[PDB]
Amino acid sequence: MLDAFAKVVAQADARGEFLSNTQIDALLAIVSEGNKRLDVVNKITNNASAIVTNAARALFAEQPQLISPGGNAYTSRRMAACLRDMEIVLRYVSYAMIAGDASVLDDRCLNGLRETYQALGTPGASVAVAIQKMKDAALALVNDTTGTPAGDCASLVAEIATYFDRAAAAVA
């Protein structure tokens, strides 16, 4: 795992270079938004159970097939595993959002998900619907104000919208 700062450094080492003033200046900008970033992540961290249950309820309302006898979310063991994977994808998007880099998402989580759900018989497209719903919820809450100075978090919302799609595309 790499964050936004170590990624630049590993590229410079491979070239044998000290970082440029441009690069240094670009990293100072991430540090300037640091407080907004910590608020985005605390909003997700603070509403995490609500975000996967509400997004799971929405999914089973749309695709009832999943929960009928024989469906892939049928039986308590299978439902508990589906909610768990929803929460895992939320954690790794949190992680990617604190680091400012997609690395932890890709290597520690999406590596093999398409294949695993396929071998298992889990419907990849439904997993992608669950992630889309969690994305919608999570961007909504990141914009709520109360205990937070008002301002513009537009870029951090575009950035966290990217991490949710990365994850939604790795399942099919």
Partner: protein, 162 residues
């Protein structure tokens, strides 16, 4: 590599947990210091060749034999000299990377891991490199907490060599 942020992610991830307020405080402490760190890195990068030349000159002054003893591992040759200044540049470059990420991770990954073996096998003395790091420490020109950040990582390298 280990930086404050990857270390925070790894701690929560090993417990199968989201970050808590503990880690957010942790990362905040890094954003607080990071302004001193990047400034230390700018002045250190801008004076890199002067600090490398002067540092090499300082170990040849403390250890004159290094330029007279024959053999591939001394600075008696022109190649001996280019290899020595190159290795001192590695120590300075890795210290600016520690400054940029806020952890000793890049120097640990790219330089400390495996250092005992190469110095033993090529018969390179740690004392020579401690004299070079001290020179940089003593004259990089920084003040206050920008100096305090530079000095913490140059002192880490000295303690790795004892």
């Amino acid at each position: 590599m280990k930086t404050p942020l990857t270390e925070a992610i790894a701690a929560a991830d090993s417990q199968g947990r989201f970050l808590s307020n503990t880690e957010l405080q942790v990362v905040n402490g890094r954003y607080n210091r990071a302004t001193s760190s990047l400034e230390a890195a700018k002045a250190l990068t801008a004076n890199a060749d002067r600090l490398i030349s002067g540092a090499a000159n300082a170990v040849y002054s403390k250890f004159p034999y290094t330029t007279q003893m024959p053999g591939p591992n001394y600075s008696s040759t022109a190649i001996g000299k280019a290899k020595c200044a190159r290795d001192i540049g590695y120590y300075l470059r890795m210290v600016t990377y520690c400054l940029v990420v806020g952890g000793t991770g890049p120097m640990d990954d790219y330089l400390v891991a495996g250092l005992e073996e190469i110095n033993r096998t090529f018969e390179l003395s740690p004392s020579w490199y401690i004299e070079a790091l001290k020179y940089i420490k003593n004259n990089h020109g920084l003040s206050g907490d920008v100096a305090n950040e530079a000095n913490t990582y140059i002192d880490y390298a000295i303690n790795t060599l004892s």
